[PDB]
Amino acid sequence: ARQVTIIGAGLAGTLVARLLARNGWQVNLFERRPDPRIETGARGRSINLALAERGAHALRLAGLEREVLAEAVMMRGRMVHVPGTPPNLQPYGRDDSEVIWSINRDRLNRILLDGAEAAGASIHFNLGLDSVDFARQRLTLSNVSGERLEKRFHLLIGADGCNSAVRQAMASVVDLGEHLETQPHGYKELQITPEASAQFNLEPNALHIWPHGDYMCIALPNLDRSFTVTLFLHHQSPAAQPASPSFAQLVDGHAARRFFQRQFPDLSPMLDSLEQDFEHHPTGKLATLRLTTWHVGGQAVLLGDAAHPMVPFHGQGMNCALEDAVALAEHLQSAADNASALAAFTAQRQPDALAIQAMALENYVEMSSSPTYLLERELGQIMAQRQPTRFIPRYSMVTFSRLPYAQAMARGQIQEQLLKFAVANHSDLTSINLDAVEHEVTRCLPPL
Ligand SMILES: Cc1cc2nc3c(=O)[nH]c(=O)nc-3n(C[C@H](O)[C@H](O)[C@H](O)COP(=O)(O)OP(=O)(O)OC[C@H]3O[C@@H](n4cnc5c(N)ncnc54)[C@H](O)[C@@H]3O)c2cc1C
Ligand SMILES: [Cl-]
């Protein structure tokens, strides 16, 4: 039986552990944090995420989709809150087949942990990877106190998140060709109680957005009708605009309250613990990191956030990591040797990871901030009705299909240019020749 060591019992790490163990691999998984299934007196984490077709299909192959969706809230559409006008639901698709699921992160992690152990994997908690000696095939782990433990390894999988210790150890034996692009936005997690959401009639089966240009708020529902709110705001005010809002200008919780009362007046009354949450929850950091190399021969490989950190403006990070886990287990199972598998996995997944990283950065302007946009959207809806197998909106290709990310991006660019050109010198749809646009659709877009 083939042997494998995995670092990180997160979302990608636990899924890949189950897929390999059920195929007869001898699997050992190491996690820095304690086992979350061991109940303590401490408060549970209220963090949630948007699960789409890519992530759901990966769970379906693993035999875990039913268990996960049993505790997921259906999001049928987007609820945009702009002051003055009441919110109106913008449905994602034709029916409840085209939806996104809101799931508690800790609940998903516990289901995955149970799944990896049921398949035969051994999980070791309270052990963080410190360093790797590739030539001697040994690694060093330690608990929070710093007490060290050495282990021999054969194949190493880096599923240890955006600040990966496996990636740091690899950078010493190979040039990874790393390119980091910092993000000016920070984030803060806040809460809406079940009592407050019900009092203010906040729709439970939708994803909520409070757009405000350079900054914004999003809210995802929980099973108990509570909501997890995320504020996206610049860490620092720029030199060009010194008076602009930023985290630096929000010295305490009282400062945060006055800011919300002024910029988000319909959201502020729903945030009862705004002051406490602002001061106790730390500000998170965002970035895009691109690597030319994801592996070291047949010895080590990276996947998920360890391989491709991305901005969270498309809700596809977890979805991508689960898709990576399926591809890695498939390559390792059927290759001539581990070196061949790691090279082929890297070649297949790298162009897709670059495509989703670029699409996530582009999606920020869509969520946070036109007469020309509405005409393009109207013509795009008609083209999708005439040719539903050729004209599929980019958001729909990413979120509701398994088309490779690079293909979704390429087809999306063809459609965006087709719509832009068609409306360019026209006041309204009555002056636009619909059959001529349809001809461009059939000429430039093959059926799927
Ligand atoms: C604000 C925000 C919102 C998001 N919303 C969404 C969303 O709606 N939909 C979506 O698809 N994605 C979303 N994402 C992205 C998503 O959270 C991540 O992409 C995903 O968790 C990555 O999975 P992973 O397994 O690669 O890493 P992780 O889930 O981060 O797991 C890494 C694991 O490794 C462990 N670890 C770290 N270092 C070590 C070490 N040295 N030794 C041992 N163990 C270690 C960690 O404790 C952790 O358990 C969001 C991200 C952010 C920041
Ligand atoms: Cl994301």
Author numbering: 7 to 375, 379 to 457
Copy out sentences from the published article reporting this entry, exactly as the authors wrote them.
Kynurenine-3-monooxygenase (KMO) is a class A flavoprotein monooxygenase (FPMO) which catalyses the hydroxylation of L-kynurenine (L-Kyn) to 3-hydroxykynurenine (3-HK), using NADPH as a co-substrate. It lies at a key branch point of the kynurenine pathway and its expression is largely restricted to the liver, kidney, some monocytic cells, and to a lesser extent in the microglia within the brain. We therefore turned our attention to the homologous bacterial P. fluorescens enzyme, Pf-KMO, which shares 34% sequence identity with the human enzyme, but lacks the transmembrane region and had been previously extensively characterized by Crozier-Reabe et al.. The KMO monomer consists of three domains: the α+β FAD-binding domain, an α+β domain containing a six-stranded, mostly antiparallel, β-sheet and a C-terminal four-helix bundle domain.
Further rounds of improvement were successful in delivering a high resolution-diffracting monoclinic crystal form with two holoenzyme molecules in the asymmetric unit that was amenable to ligand soaking studies.
